[PDB]
């Protein structure tokens, strides 16, 4: 079999790797290609801070809940391992803040040592009245992409820097199975109106002492529009911007100020911090992760599609569970092509 | 009314700073001046990471528990302060790891959100079977001294670098009150058998993805002789050395390997971090911290001396509670020339 994986981002490569390993033995000519328009230092997966944390409420798909959990376990089972450094993986604890009470999550047991905030801690953040504290994981995308690649290279997966214009284009030229892991730009390959870019702008600042992450939440501002502070590895991440259908990949001076003024008030130790950089990204926002098969129709023979897009603000967080599901379905494509 | 402080350690500098900040207004002739043999970077303080954590067992003079409490409350009310970054202050969470079940401390209700560890967390550390988790503070010496330095210099205080040979020597030139902060080298000023140095070595290393502290305990080989990893502000601190009566102030090759071999087994990710510095200090070990007031005999009439030394491996932890008692003691003296 010949396999083509469009998309060289976290979703795309995790899959390519996870499809390889699993069916490397039970398939003679398993030849995986990756096509993509922007590689590892230039994707939406790079803009992400990579903090493990799914939506605050149940998604339409509870098949999703298990997925983010699946990633977390795999990740934590490799935090205290040599690779972890190359992976951009490590533990990180922090505050989740609200303006009022609110039910627990779902990942409640998934995350490590989940517990409610205490009065005495709340004091440190005047503007808020209720919140949480727990231990999670950060999977930095720049080290993850880099690692996944080297992993995929030794496996023999080749990479090509081409903008696919159509599944047919690839089918018609030899593709047996096509994995669409093309995120927020999946639209151009197949009109999807439920897939919108929730615009993200962030700030990378040098403030080492920051050791705890601080996501806040206010209903009037909106999902990921409430300020957050995620100390990464070599720098700490300011951010808190969410804007649907704003395909504007460019830093906004007015956003800058709402991130700055916003996070400062949260932790004024920040005011005399240092701005290393400012970046913009698009959360592939969609009601529920598109993870399913499709039957594209051509000249002679029909070719399968495995769609893997729309993870929005929780890409890194749910990546594996999905990349490991997509492989699941890929084995179903083989049983059907009768091979075994 | 001349005051002479000897020792520009955390104890010296902090005490010398309350005596002023809290009396400069009530004494037209208030003269504070500190003498020291070793300044800013060459004190024991400098070798300390500065993690606020007393001893597991209760303090001997039950007043100390109260002083630590005072420290963590003055520190915690300034964690988000305009100066928090200067003082070298920041919150930080982490693990204690015991081999067996072991009673709670007593400061449990003074740190931020104490609690036992779940078994999934104990899976991070195979060698161990039981532990604690909580948020705390780090007061880096290298910067906490430099802070107190400037606060003092603008407050009129003067620093002179000289190796005081005797108490008389100071009295002779007109020391009305002498506040002794000599710490470990206190012995050679007024013989003390109970004040011993527990020599300590550490290792500063480059591993930014460290976010929690990991203090292991191993009663096998006594106090502090178990690895620990305290992430600093610029660099992470390895270590786990307690050696009583060792006045050797030079790094040891077998200590280096103990610091390394031993720390890595805890956090294997460390097996790759770059080594930045190795230093050595002496913990002012003494059955119970010498904070009192003695009437020092000097020829004709007297010259007052306040003792404040022997703060074990928890100088920083309790530094403040003392600097505030000692000024209280500087009050009782000031009320015996019978002044309002
Ligand atoms: C500010 C911000 C903060 C975030 N923080 C977090 C966080 O803390 N935790 C978290 O889990 N997630 C976070 N995310 C989001 C997360 O990073 C993404 O959801 C995850 O990267 C989606 O994987 P992906 O879709 O980005 O793969 P992508 O990066 O979208 O893959 C894109 C690649 O596919 C290629 N491609 C697309 N279409 C075609 C085509 N037609 N032909 C050829 N190639 C094509 C593109 O050229 C591109 O190179 C954040 C996002 C933003 C914007
Ligand atoms: C390896 C190590 C790790 C540690 N980690 C921690 C930690 O995480 N948290 C914590 O709280 N504590 C820690 N400590 C210990 C803690 O830092 C010390 O207890 C605290 O620094 C004591 O303040 P001090 O008494 O040393 O002031 P000092 O450093 O004792 O003041 C010393 C100064 O006084 C001068 N002096 C003394 N006698 C005279 C004299 N006769 N004339 C003139 N000058 C004189 C000296 O020359 C010197 O300049 C650690 C210690 C070590 C060794």
Curated annotation (Swiss-Prot), chains A, B:
Compartments reported by the entry: Peroxisome matrix; Cytoplasm, Cytosol; Presynaptic active zone; Secreted
Q: What is its EC number?
A: 1.4.3.3
Q: Where does D-serine bind?
A: 224, 228, 283, 313
Region annotation (Active site lid that may open upon substrate/product migration in and out of the active site and close to increase the hydrophobicity of the active site, to make the hydride transfer reaction more efficient) maps to 216-228
Q: What is the effect of changing residue 201 to R?
A: Found in a patient with ALS; impairs FAD binding; decreased affinity for D-serine, D-alanine and D-proline; leads to tetramerization of the holoenzyme
Let me know which tissues express this protein, per UniProt. Expressed in the cerebellum, in astrocytes of the cortex, in motor neurons and fibers of the lumbar spinal cord (at protein level). Expressed in goblet cells of the small intestine (at protein level). Increased in the cerebellum of schizophrenic patients (at protein level). Decreased in motor neurons of the spinal cord of patients with amyotrophic lateral sclerosis (at protein level). Expressed in the cerebellum, spinal cord, kidney, and thalamus. Abundant in glia of the cerebellum and predominantly neuronal in the dorsolateral prefrontal cortex, hippocampus and substantia nigra.
Q: Which keywords label this protein?
A: Amyotrophic lateral sclerosis, Cell projection, Cytoplasm, Disease variant, FAD, Flavoprotein, Neurodegeneration, Oxidoreductase, Peroxisome, Phosphoprotein, S-nitrosylation, Schizophrenia, Secreted, Synapse
Catalyzed reactions per annotation: a D-alpha-amino acid + O2 + H2O = a 2-oxocarboxylate + H2O2 + NH4(+); D-alanine + O2 + H2O = pyruvate + H2O2 + NH4(+); D-cysteine + O2 + H2O = 2-oxo-3-sulfanylpropanoate + H2O2 + NH4(+); D-dopa + O2 + H2O = 3-(3,4-dihydroxyphenyl)pyruvate + H2O2 + NH4(+)
Which residue windows are transmembrane per the record? none
Instruction: Please give the PANTHER family that the UniProt record associates with this protein.
Output: D-AMINO ACID OXIDASE, D-AMINO-ACID OXIDASE
Instruction: Tell me the function of this protein.
Output: Catalyzes the oxidative deamination of D-amino acids with broad substrate specificity. Required to catabolize D-amino acids synthesized endogenously, of gastrointestinal bacterial origin or obtained from the diet, and to use these as nutrients. Regulates the level of D-amino acid neurotransmitters in the brain, such as D-serine, a co-agonist of N-methyl D-aspartate (NMDA) receptors, and may modulate synaptic transmission. Catalyzes the first step of the racemization of D-DOPA to L-DOPA, for possible use in an alternative dopamine biosynthesis pathway.
Q: Which disease is it linked to?
A: Schizophrenia: A complex, multifactorial psychotic disorder or group of disorders characterized by disturbances in the form and content of thought (e.g. delusions, hallucinations), in mood (e.g. inappropriate affect), in sense of self and relationship to the external world (e.g. loss of ego boundaries, withdrawal), and in behavior (e.g bizarre or apparently purposeless behavior). Although it affects emotions, it is distinguished from mood disorders in which such disturbances are primary. Amyotrophic lateral sclerosis: A neurodegenerative disorder affecting upper motor neurons in the brain and lower motor neurons in the brain stem and spinal cord, resulting in fatal paralysis. Sensory abnormalities are absent. The pathologic hallmarks of the disease include pallor of the corticospinal tract due to loss of motor neurons, presence of ubiquitin-positive inclusions within surviving motor neurons, and deposition of pathologic aggregates. The etiology of amyotrophic lateral sclerosis is likely to be multifactorial, involving both genetic and environmental factors.
Q: What is this protein called?
A: D-amino-acid oxidase
């Amino acid at each position: 079999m010949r396999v083509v994986v469009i998309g060289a981002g976290v979703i795309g490569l995790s899959t390519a790797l996870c499809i390889h390993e699993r069916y490397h033995s039970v398939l003679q000519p398993l030849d995986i290609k990756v096509y993509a328009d922007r590689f590892t230092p230039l994707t939406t997966t790079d803009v992400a801070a990579g903090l493990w944390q799914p939506y605050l409420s149940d998604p339409n798909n509870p098949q999703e809940a298990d997925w983010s959990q699946q990633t977390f376990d795999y990740l934590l089972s490799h935090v205290h391992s040599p690779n972890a450094e190359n992976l951009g993986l490590f533990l990180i604890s922090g505050y989740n803040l609200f303006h009022e009470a609110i039910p627990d999550p779902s990942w409640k047991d998934t995350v490590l040592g989940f517990r409610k905030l205490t009065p005495r801690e709340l004091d440190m953040f005047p503007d808020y009245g209720y919140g949480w504290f727990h231990t999670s994981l950060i999977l930095e995308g720049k080290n993850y992409l880099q690692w996944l690649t080297e992993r995929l290279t030794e496996r023999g997966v080749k990479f090509f820097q081409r903008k696919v214009e159509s599944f047919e284009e690839v089918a018609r030229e030899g593709a047996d199975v096509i994995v669409n892991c093309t995120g927020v730009w999946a639209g151009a390959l197949q009109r999807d109106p439920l897939l919108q870019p929730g615009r993200g702008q962030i700030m990378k600042v040098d403030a080492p002492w920051m050791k705890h992450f601080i996501l806040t939440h206010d209903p009037e501002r909106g999902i990921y529009n409430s300020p957050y502070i995620i100390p990464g590895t070599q720098t700490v991440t300011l951010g808190g911007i969410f804007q649907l259908g704003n395909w504007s990949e460019l830093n906004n001076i007015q956003d800058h100020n709402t991130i700055w003024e916003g996070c400062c008030r949260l932790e004024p130790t920040l005011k005399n911090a240092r701005i290393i950089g400012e970046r913009t990204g698009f959360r592939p926002v969609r009601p529920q992760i598109r993870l399913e098969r499709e039957q594209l129709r051509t000249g002679p023979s029909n070719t399968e599609v495995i769609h893997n897009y729309g993870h929005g603000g929780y890409g890194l967080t749910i990546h594996w569970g999905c990349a490991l599901e997509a492989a699941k379905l890929f084995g179903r494509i083989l049983e059907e092509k009768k091979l075994s």
